[PDB]
Amino acid sequence: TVQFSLYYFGNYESEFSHDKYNLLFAGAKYADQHGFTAVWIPERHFHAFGGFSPNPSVIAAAIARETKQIQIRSGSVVLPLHHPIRVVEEWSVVDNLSQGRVGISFASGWNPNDFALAPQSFGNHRELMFQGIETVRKLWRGEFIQVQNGVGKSISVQAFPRPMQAELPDWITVVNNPETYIKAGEMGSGVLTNLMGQSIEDLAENIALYRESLEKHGYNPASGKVTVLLHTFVGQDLEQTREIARQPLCDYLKSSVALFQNLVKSQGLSAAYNRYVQSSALIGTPASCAEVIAKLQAIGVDEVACLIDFGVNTPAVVESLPDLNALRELCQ
Amino acid sequence: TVQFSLYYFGNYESEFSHDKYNLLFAGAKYADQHGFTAVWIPERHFHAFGGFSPNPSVIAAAIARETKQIQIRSGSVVLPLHHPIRVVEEWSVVDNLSQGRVGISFASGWNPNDFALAPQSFGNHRELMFQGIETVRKLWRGEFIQVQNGVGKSISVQAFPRPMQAELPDWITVVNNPETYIKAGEMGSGVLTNLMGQSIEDLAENIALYRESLEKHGYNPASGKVTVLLHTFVGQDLEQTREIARQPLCDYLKSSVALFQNLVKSQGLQVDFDQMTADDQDYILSAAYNRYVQSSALIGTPASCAEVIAKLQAIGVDEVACLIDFGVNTPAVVESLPDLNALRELCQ
C-alpha cells in the first residue's frame, strides 16, 4: 500500500506574518500523530513567496523537536548551493535531534540567480551534484575525505557529529529525464518526482526504467523508493473542494511560462487544469482521490508527498487534515 | 546587575551516543526556567571533541522549540566559513521559530583546517568577517544587496524569511586585541571575550576602549554589550568542586601549545617552555589551574564565585556566559546547575 506524507512548498500567510510556520507545525504534528510517513521541506531563496525554508536542515531541526515518529526529509537539498561537508554536518545534527528520522532528496538547481550562493558552480552543476552525493554518502558512513585547507594543504576530515542512521536514506529529484531515473537506480537512490511536468504514462515508464536499473546494479528491488509530489486538498464535497483549490492552484501553475507550458504538454488554461486535478492531483473527496492513488500504486509509486500549502487559506487547510487522513485510511 | 547565561563548547558523552544533546537540552531548559539570559552555542568542525554544533543555526532552531524566554545566541558564527546570505536566512528562520530571541557573535576563524569550507577565504578572513557583518545587517534590515549570479550577471536580492526583530543583536568575538574592541564600538556591536588569554585588568582596559569608541561614534553607552565566557562548575564544597573540575579542565587547557602557553602567561608564571619536562608541566599546569579558578573562572562555591562576578561587574561586564560542558561528567554537571542558579541569585 502507498505511503502518505506531507510536502511543503514553503508558503506562509504573509511575508510579514508573525506565525510564518503556522501550517508547517500544524500539519507536521497532525501527520506525525496520524500514521503519515514523512514530512518533506524545500530549499528556496530570494522570494517572499514560498520562502520559509532557505535551508531545510534548520526547519528540520525544529520539526524534530515537535514530532516523534514522522520522517523528516528534504524535498530538495540543492546540493551545488552547499558544501557537501555542511550537508552531512547539518543533517547529522537533525538525525541526532530526531533519533534517526531524516532523509534527503538531492537536486541540481537550474536558476542561475540561486547560484548567487555558489557563483562558480553553475554550468556543470548537475555533474557537481552527483559528485557531491558520493561525498555526502561517504562522510555520512563515517569515512574520511580529502580536501584542501585554507593554506593549500591536503587534509583528511570526518564530519561530526556522527549520525545515528548508518546509511543516509536518499533520493534523486527528477521530472521526466529517463537518464536520471536510470542514474538513480545505478546509485541505489530513490526518485522524487511530480506530475506537473510529466504524464502518468511517462511516469509509469520512468519508474520501470528505474526499477530495471536497480536490479541490474545489484540492489534489491524492494529497496527502491519512488515518491511523487501531488497537489493535495481533500474535502467531503467534490465540487466545493475543487472550487476552494481552483484559484490558488491556477495562480501557481500560471505564475511562470515553464509551469504553464509543462502542464499543458503533460496533459496533452482551464482545460489542462480540469484534467490535471482529476488524474494527477489529490484534490477532491477521499473517494475521488483514492482512484488517483490506485492508478499510482499500480504503476509502482511507493509514497505520495501531499503538497498542502499551495495557497488555500490556512484555517481551511487545517480543517482539511482529517479529510486527508480519511483518504490515507481508505488506501491504508 | 550582571546577566547569567550558559555557553556550550559542544561536548557529548561518547562518539556514537544516542543522546548527544543530553546536556544541551537539560541545561538550556533549566536556564530558560531559572532567570538566565541566553544560551550560547558554538561552531566547530572535524572533531568529535566539542563537535555537536557544526552550524549553530541548526541547533538553535531546536532550542527554539524547547524553550520559551531565553535568548539563543551563537558564540560564534565563523562568518568567513559561510555565505553571509545563508547566515541571515538561517538565523531569520530561528528568529521566527523563537519569536524574536536570536543573537549572533561573529568570529573570523584562525585554523586553516576549518577553511576547507572556504578555501579561498583564509588570509583575508578578518576583513571578510567585517564586510560580511555589514552584509548580514543590511539583509536583516530588509535591504537588497547586489551579488553575482551563476552566469556572471549582477542581481539584487533580499533574504527570506523576514526576521521578527527589527535589528539583529550582534557581537564581535575578540580576545585581547584593542583595535577589535574599538572596531566593535564603531559598529555599535557587542564584544564576546574570555579570560583564558588575558587578565581582568587587560579586559578592564579593553572594555574601556570599547565603551569610549561607542559614544565617540554616536551610540548610547547603554547600548554596549560586554559578554565574557567563563569556565563554570559551582558546588557547595570549595575544595571538592575544584577537584572535580581539575582533570577535565586541565586536559583541555593542555590540549594545544597555544592553550597551555597562553594560560601560563595569563596567570603570571615564569616558564622556559623549551626546558619544561613532563613532570615540570604537571606542577606548572596545577599552579596555573589554581590561579585560574581563583581569579578568572566560576569554579567553586556560590560565595567564592560571587567575588569573581563582583570584579567583572565593576569593570563593566554585562553578561557572563557560563561554559559548563568542558568535560565534567554529565550527571555531575546537571547536579551543579542549581548551584549555578544559587550564584545567579546572589548576584541577581
mmCIF file of C-alpha atoms in Angstrom, chain B residues 97-316:
data_model
loop_
_atom_site.group_PDB
_atom_site.id
_atom_site.type_symbol
_atom_site.label_atom_id
_atom_site.label_comp_id
_atom_site.label_asym_id
_atom_site.label_seq_id
_atom_site.Cartn_x
_atom_site.Cartn_y
_atom_site.Cartn_z
ATOM 1 C CA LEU B 97 10.811 29.919 15.240
ATOM 2 C CA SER B 98 11.739 31.547 18.557
ATOM 3 C CA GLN B 99 9.533 34.682 18.426
ATOM 4 C CA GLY B 100 12.492 37.044 18.289
ATOM 5 C CA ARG B 101 15.085 35.555 20.622
ATOM 6 C CA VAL B 102 18.267 35.213 18.492
ATOM 7 C CA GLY B 103 21.624 36.945 18.681
ATOM 8 C CA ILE B 104 24.927 36.344 16.912
ATOM 9 C CA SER B 105 28.566 36.846 17.804
ATOM 10 C CA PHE B 106 30.822 36.829 14.748
ATOM 11 C CA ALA B 107 34.291 35.293 14.629
ATOM 12 C CA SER B 108 36.841 35.409 11.830
ATOM 13 C CA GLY B 109 38.349 31.953 12.279
ATOM 14 C CA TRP B 110 42.028 31.155 12.707
ATOM 15 C CA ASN B 111 42.582 27.464 11.948
ATOM 16 C CA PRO B 112 43.269 26.911 8.218
ATOM 17 C CA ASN B 113 41.799 23.414 8.545
ATOM 18 C CA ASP B 114 38.338 24.917 9.133
ATOM 19 C CA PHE B 115 38.780 26.806 5.889
ATOM 20 C CA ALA B 116 38.406 23.565 3.989
ATOM 21 C CA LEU B 117 34.861 25.004 3.923
ATOM 22 C CA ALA B 118 36.107 28.270 2.329
ATOM 23 C CA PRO B 119 39.494 27.533 0.757
ATOM 24 C CA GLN B 120 39.901 30.941 -0.899
ATOM 25 C CA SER B 121 38.884 32.866 2.223
ATOM 26 C CA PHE B 122 41.881 32.259 4.542
ATOM 27 C CA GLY B 123 44.228 35.215 4.872
ATOM 28 C CA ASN B 124 41.635 37.939 4.315
ATOM 29 C CA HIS B 125 39.255 36.375 6.829
ATOM 30 C CA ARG B 126 39.288 39.229 9.349
ATOM 31 C CA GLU B 127 38.246 41.785 6.729
ATOM 32 C CA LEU B 128 35.905 39.239 5.126
ATOM 33 C CA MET B 129 34.205 38.990 8.521
ATOM 34 C CA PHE B 130 33.710 42.733 8.937
ATOM 35 C CA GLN B 131 32.482 43.100 5.366
ATOM 36 C CA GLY B 132 30.162 40.147 5.934
ATOM 37 C CA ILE B 133 28.718 41.601 9.141
ATOM 38 C CA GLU B 134 27.653 44.679 7.208
ATOM 39 C CA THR B 135 26.019 42.452 4.572
ATOM 40 C CA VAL B 136 24.259 40.439 7.269
ATOM 41 C CA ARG B 137 22.962 43.652 8.866
ATOM 42 C CA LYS B 138 21.742 45.110 5.564
ATOM 43 C CA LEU B 139 19.926 41.876 4.710
ATOM 44 C CA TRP B 140 18.443 41.590 8.216
ATOM 45 C CA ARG B 141 17.048 45.114 7.808
ATOM 46 C CA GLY B 142 15.281 44.096 4.579
ATOM 47 C CA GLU B 143 17.658 45.832 2.180
ATOM 48 C CA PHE B 144 18.509 44.468 -1.235
ATOM 49 C CA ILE B 145 22.156 43.620 -1.859
ATOM 50 C CA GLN B 146 23.995 43.252 -5.156
ATOM 51 C CA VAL B 147 25.562 39.846 -5.887
ATOM 52 C CA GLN B 148 26.829 37.976 -8.933
ATOM 53 C CA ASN B 149 24.628 35.081 -10.038
ATOM 54 C CA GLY B 150 25.725 31.834 -11.682
ATOM 55 C CA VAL B 151 26.254 33.380 -15.135
ATOM 56 C CA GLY B 152 28.154 36.483 -14.019
ATOM 57 C CA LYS B 153 25.199 38.892 -14.010
ATOM 58 C CA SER B 154 24.807 41.315 -11.124
ATOM 59 C CA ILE B 155 21.470 40.839 -9.352
ATOM 60 C CA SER B 156 19.675 42.474 -6.427
ATOM 61 C CA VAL B 157 18.312 40.113 -3.758
ATOM 62 C CA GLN B 158 16.639 40.162 -0.360
ATOM 63 C CA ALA B 159 16.873 37.341 2.163
ATOM 64 C CA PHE B 160 13.809 35.429 3.400
ATOM 65 C CA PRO B 161 12.082 34.837 5.704
ATOM 66 C CA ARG B 162 11.943 38.336 7.098
ATOM 67 C CA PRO B 163 13.024 38.382 10.761
ATOM 68 C CA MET B 164 10.865 39.250 13.749
ATOM 69 C CA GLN B 165 13.448 41.531 15.406
ATOM 70 C CA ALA B 166 13.921 44.869 13.634
ATOM 71 C CA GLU B 167 17.678 44.734 14.294
ATOM 72 C CA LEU B 168 19.952 41.768 14.862
ATOM 73 C CA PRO B 169 21.606 41.705 18.308
ATOM 74 C CA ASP B 170 25.251 41.122 17.413
ATOM 75 C CA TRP B 171 28.711 40.851 18.949
ATOM 76 C CA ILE B 172 32.313 40.628 17.749
ATOM 77 C CA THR B 173 34.330 37.742 19.163
ATOM 78 C CA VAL B 174 37.651 39.064 20.479
ATOM 79 C CA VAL B 175 40.464 38.167 22.851
ATOM 80 C CA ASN B 176 42.861 40.996 23.744
ATOM 81 C CA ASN B 177 43.310 42.946 20.502
ATOM 82 C CA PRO B 178 42.387 46.547 21.436
ATOM 83 C CA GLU B 179 41.613 47.629 17.867
ATOM 84 C CA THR B 180 38.889 44.969 17.643
ATOM 85 C CA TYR B 181 37.272 46.362 20.795
ATOM 86 C CA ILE B 182 37.425 49.814 19.186
ATOM 87 C CA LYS B 183 36.111 48.400 15.892
ATOM 88 C CA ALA B 184 33.175 46.837 17.717
ATOM 89 C CA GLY B 185 32.346 50.220 19.254
ATOM 90 C CA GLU B 186 32.467 51.865 15.834
ATOM 91 C CA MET B 187 29.893 49.319 14.610
ATOM 92 C CA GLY B 188 27.775 49.530 17.741
ATOM 93 C CA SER B 189 28.304 45.792 18.130
ATOM 94 C CA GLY B 190 28.890 43.893 21.356
ATOM 95 C CA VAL B 191 32.090 42.125 22.336
ATOM 96 C CA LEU B 192 32.334 38.448 23.312
ATOM 97 C CA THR B 193 35.603 37.567 25.012
ATOM 98 C CA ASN B 194 37.237 35.254 27.557
ATOM 99 C CA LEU B 195 39.902 35.114 30.275
ATOM 100 C CA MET B 196 41.885 32.112 29.027
ATOM 101 C CA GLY B 197 44.333 34.545 27.433
ATOM 102 C CA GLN B 198 44.082 37.897 29.189
ATOM 103 C CA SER B 199 43.814 39.371 32.678
ATOM 104 C CA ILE B 200 40.851 41.092 34.281
ATOM 105 C CA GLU B 201 42.842 44.337 34.169
ATOM 106 C CA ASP B 202 43.641 43.714 30.489
ATOM 107 C CA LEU B 203 39.926 43.082 29.997
ATOM 108 C CA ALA B 204 39.100 46.200 32.015
ATOM 109 C CA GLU B 205 41.355 48.217 29.708
ATOM 110 C CA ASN B 206 39.892 46.671 26.548
ATOM 111 C CA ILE B 207 36.371 47.270 27.865
ATOM 112 C CA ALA B 208 37.189 50.940 28.430
ATOM 113 C CA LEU B 209 38.391 51.438 24.852
ATOM 114 C CA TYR B 210 35.231 49.709 23.616
ATOM 115 C CA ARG B 211 32.827 51.909 25.582
ATOM 116 C CA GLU B 212 34.829 55.009 24.629
ATOM 117 C CA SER B 213 34.684 54.114 20.930
ATOM 118 C CA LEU B 214 30.918 53.536 21.240
ATOM 119 C CA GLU B 215 29.982 57.065 22.326
ATOM 120 C CA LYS B 216 32.628 58.523 20.004
ATOM 121 C CA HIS B 217 30.642 57.061 17.096
ATOM 122 C CA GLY B 218 27.219 58.121 18.349
ATOM 123 C CA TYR B 219 25.984 55.074 20.244
ATOM 124 C CA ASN B 220 24.476 55.213 23.696
ATOM 125 C CA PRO B 221 26.843 53.609 26.247
ATOM 126 C CA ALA B 222 23.764 51.677 27.438
ATOM 127 C CA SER B 223 23.659 50.001 24.012
ATOM 128 C CA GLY B 224 27.039 48.373 24.644
ATOM 129 C CA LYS B 225 27.151 44.620 25.233
ATOM 130 C CA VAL B 226 30.122 43.044 27.036
ATOM 131 C CA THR B 227 29.900 39.257 27.383
ATOM 132 C CA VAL B 228 32.637 37.122 28.969
ATOM 133 C CA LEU B 229 32.910 33.357 28.575
ATOM 134 C CA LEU B 230 33.821 31.742 31.910
ATOM 135 C CA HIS B 231 34.568 28.123 32.714
ATOM 136 C CA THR B 232 31.862 27.212 35.211
ATOM 137 C CA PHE B 233 31.280 24.425 37.736
ATOM 138 C CA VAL B 234 29.694 25.523 41.021
ATOM 139 C CA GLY B 235 29.230 23.380 44.121
ATOM 140 C CA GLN B 236 28.741 23.527 47.852
ATOM 141 C CA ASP B 237 32.238 22.356 48.856
ATOM 142 C CA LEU B 238 35.008 24.612 47.531
ATOM 143 C CA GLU B 239 37.814 22.035 47.556
ATOM 144 C CA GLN B 240 35.733 19.141 46.215
ATOM 145 C CA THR B 241 34.262 21.302 43.440
ATOM 146 C CA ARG B 242 37.639 22.456 42.157
ATOM 147 C CA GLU B 243 38.994 18.909 42.347
ATOM 148 C CA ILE B 244 36.078 17.582 40.258
ATOM 149 C CA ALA B 245 36.729 20.185 37.540
ATOM 150 C CA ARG B 246 40.534 19.880 37.624
ATOM 151 C CA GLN B 247 41.325 16.929 35.353
ATOM 152 C CA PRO B 248 38.653 17.808 32.731
ATOM 153 C CA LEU B 249 39.649 21.472 32.508
ATOM 154 C CA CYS B 250 43.401 20.812 32.636
ATOM 155 C CA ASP B 251 43.096 18.184 29.908
ATOM 156 C CA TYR B 252 41.547 20.895 27.735
ATOM 157 C CA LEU B 253 43.992 23.659 28.756
ATOM 158 C CA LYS B 254 46.973 21.483 27.774
ATOM 159 C CA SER B 255 45.428 20.025 24.603
ATOM 160 C CA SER B 256 47.404 22.502 22.448
ATOM 161 C CA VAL B 257 50.601 24.505 22.754
ATOM 162 C CA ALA B 258 48.728 27.800 22.395
ATOM 163 C CA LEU B 259 46.133 26.935 25.039
ATOM 164 C CA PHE B 260 48.816 25.865 27.515
ATOM 165 C CA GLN B 261 51.264 28.692 26.900
ATOM 166 C CA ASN B 262 48.575 31.387 26.845
ATOM 167 C CA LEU B 263 47.271 30.049 30.167
ATOM 168 C CA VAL B 264 50.710 30.015 31.801
ATOM 169 C CA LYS B 265 51.356 33.535 30.521
ATOM 170 C CA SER B 266 47.986 34.974 31.556
ATOM 171 C CA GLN B 267 48.436 33.549 35.078
ATOM 172 C CA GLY B 268 51.789 35.303 35.557
ATOM 173 C CA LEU B 269 54.007 32.211 35.728
ATOM 174 C CA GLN B 270 57.635 32.198 34.562
ATOM 175 C CA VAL B 271 58.398 29.105 32.465
ATOM 176 C CA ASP B 272 61.115 28.223 29.957
ATOM 177 C CA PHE B 273 58.919 26.164 27.651
ATOM 178 C CA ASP B 274 61.934 24.694 25.840
ATOM 179 C CA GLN B 275 63.309 23.095 29.041
ATOM 180 C CA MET B 276 59.936 22.189 30.577
ATOM 181 C CA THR B 277 59.781 18.454 31.249
ATOM 182 C CA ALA B 278 56.662 16.312 31.575
ATOM 183 C CA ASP B 279 56.900 16.396 35.370
ATOM 184 C CA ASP B 280 57.529 20.152 35.236
ATOM 185 C CA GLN B 281 54.306 20.681 33.274
ATOM 186 C CA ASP B 282 52.390 18.758 35.945
ATOM 187 C CA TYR B 283 53.462 21.293 38.574
ATOM 188 C CA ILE B 284 53.082 24.290 36.252
ATOM 189 C CA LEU B 285 49.629 23.311 34.994
ATOM 190 C CA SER B 286 48.461 22.663 38.551
ATOM 191 C CA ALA B 287 49.653 26.123 39.598
ATOM 192 C CA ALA B 288 48.117 27.770 36.516
ATOM 193 C CA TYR B 289 44.815 25.982 37.185
ATOM 194 C CA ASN B 290 44.878 27.039 40.837
ATOM 195 C CA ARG B 291 45.383 30.701 39.871
ATOM 196 C CA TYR B 292 42.815 30.460 37.082
ATOM 197 C CA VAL B 293 39.950 29.140 39.202
ATOM 198 C CA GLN B 294 40.740 31.649 41.939
ATOM 199 C CA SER B 295 40.611 34.694 39.671
ATOM 200 C CA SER B 296 39.269 34.071 36.166
ATOM 201 C CA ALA B 297 36.568 31.385 36.236
ATOM 202 C CA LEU B 298 33.424 30.336 38.106
ATOM 203 C CA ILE B 299 34.698 27.098 39.635
ATOM 204 C CA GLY B 300 33.985 26.963 43.367
ATOM 205 C CA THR B 301 31.109 27.891 45.672
ATOM 206 C CA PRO B 302 28.379 30.476 45.118
ATOM 207 C CA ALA B 303 30.178 32.634 47.679
ATOM 208 C CA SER B 304 33.650 32.288 46.151
ATOM 209 C CA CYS B 305 32.423 32.743 42.570
ATOM 210 C CA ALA B 306 30.352 35.790 43.531
ATOM 211 C CA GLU B 307 33.628 37.574 44.287
ATOM 212 C CA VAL B 308 34.661 36.974 40.671
ATOM 213 C CA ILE B 309 31.301 38.273 39.395
ATOM 214 C CA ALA B 310 31.734 41.413 41.519
ATOM 215 C CA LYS B 311 35.113 42.202 39.956
ATOM 216 C CA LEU B 312 33.657 41.696 36.483
ATOM 217 C CA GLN B 313 30.622 43.864 37.202
ATOM 218 C CA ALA B 314 32.940 46.649 38.381
ATOM 219 C CA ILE B 315 34.991 46.719 35.158
ATOM 220 C CA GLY B 316 31.813 46.862 33.070
#
